Write a protein that binds this ligand. Structure first.
Ligand SMILES: CC(=O)N[C@H]1[C@H]([C@H](O)[C@H](O)CO)OC(C(=O)O)=C[C@@H]1O
Length: 358
């Protein structure tokens, strides 16, 4: 077809109530509405800043966006509370939407102490907001205790963006959301948090790697779950691991030289999420990140047609400043992209024809 690439800002620093906006999360409701979530930052900083989780909705495929509404409101007055780094997760079977995020008080990620008590202001808590009405109203839950099987895990945070629901195998229906934890030795590890009962209970899998950070997972054509991670040890590339199970454990972590990265968040999705297992279309992956190894710039989309082995097609969508980016498959066959150009958060829409390879 004919190449399509358009973009418009959803939030710009200083307008609509907050001096700074950051951290994109994007998803599509079962009704087909597009939901964009991000941080509203009063002091322009990460947790423990008294941040708010915000949301904008589009009912016409991303063309027009409704007003900025608050999902979780931070408290700028003492007792200070903050809510940051959103990640959406839609249970396509039940139609339920989840929005995972941090619940901070006195500490952020690096400073969190061990503990699980919601009342303890020294721990960085894990929260989930649940909606059964398409993202209109939300019910909140602190699940730190449920996802901390090892008392030595002193900190954690859901990787911002969008999680997944498995379609194949013995664990089909399973909701997976990635987290980064800091263990007793001070090591940064990746871990899958999942639910087999459509969100009633959440539990952690086995932690993997060292030098890990914000990480994402995708279900491959054979049902294997590929983990793609930001490298906190700064190799200049993305780290990768694979899981063949559901009681999540991942194999060894290796550096992927095909994916340069300056130690920043990225997104990896299935181009055709509904394709049947083993089919050619099920092997197609899209990846968005900053390709520069020296700075957060040169935002590009890469495409693989072999479950992530090779990435023969790539195109730059933002030559300049580009930090965090997330992708989702829209029902019209195109792709939504929420990203950070340095001025707040911007929404972009593109199709495969635009990519050039196919
Ligand atoms: C909970 C939290 O702190 N999230 C932040 C995250 C984290 O600090 C880093 O991943 C090192 O672990 O990094 C950044 C960043 O732009 O680099 C922004 C996130 O809001």
């Amino acid at each position: 077809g004919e190449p399509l690439y358009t973009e418009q800002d959803l939030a710009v620093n200083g307008r609509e109530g907050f001096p700074n906006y950051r951290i994109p999360a994007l998803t599509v409701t079962p009704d087909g509405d597009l939901l964009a979530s991000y941080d509203g930052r009063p002091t322009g900083i990460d947790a423990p800043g008294p941040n708010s989780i915000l949301q904008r909705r589009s009912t016409d495929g991303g063309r027009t966006w409704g007003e900025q509404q608050v999902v979780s409101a931070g408290q700028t007055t003492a007792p200070i509370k903050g809510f940051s780094d959103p990640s959406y997760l839609v249970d396509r079977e039940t139609g339920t939407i989840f929005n995972f995020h941090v619940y901070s008080q006195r500490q952020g990620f690096a400073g969190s102490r061990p503990g699980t008590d919601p009342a303890d202001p020294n721990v960085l808590h894990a929260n989930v907001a649940t909606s059964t009405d398409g993202g209109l109203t939300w019910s909140h839950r602190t699940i730190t205790a449920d996802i901390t099987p090892d008392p030595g895990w002193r900190s954690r945070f859901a990787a911002s963006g969008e999680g997944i629901q498995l379609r194949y195998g013995p664990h089909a229906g399973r909701l997976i959301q990635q987290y980064t934890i800091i263990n007793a030795a001070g090591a940064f590890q990746a871990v899958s948090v999942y639910s087999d009962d459509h969100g009633r209970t959440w539990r952690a899998g086995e932690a993997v790697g060292v030098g890990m950070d914000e990480n994402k997972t995708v279900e491959l054509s054979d049902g294997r779950v590929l983990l793609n991670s930001r490298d906190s040890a700064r190799s200049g590339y993305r780290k990768v691991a694979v899981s063949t199970d559901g009681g999540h454990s991942y194999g060894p972590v290796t550096i992927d030289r095909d994916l340069p990265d300056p130690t920043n968040n990225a997104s990896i999705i299935r181009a055709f999420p509904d394709a049947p297992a083993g089919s050619a279309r099920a092997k197609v992956l899209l990846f968005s990140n900053a390709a520069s190894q020296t700075s957060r710039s040169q935002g590009t989309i890469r495409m693989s047609c072999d479950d992530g082995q090779t990435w023969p097609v790539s195109k730059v969508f933002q030559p300049g400043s580009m930090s965090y980016s997330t992708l989702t498959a829209l029902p019209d066959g195109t792709y939504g992209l929420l990203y950070e150009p340095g001025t707040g958060i911007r929404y972009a829409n593109f199709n495969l024809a635009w990519l050039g390879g196919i």
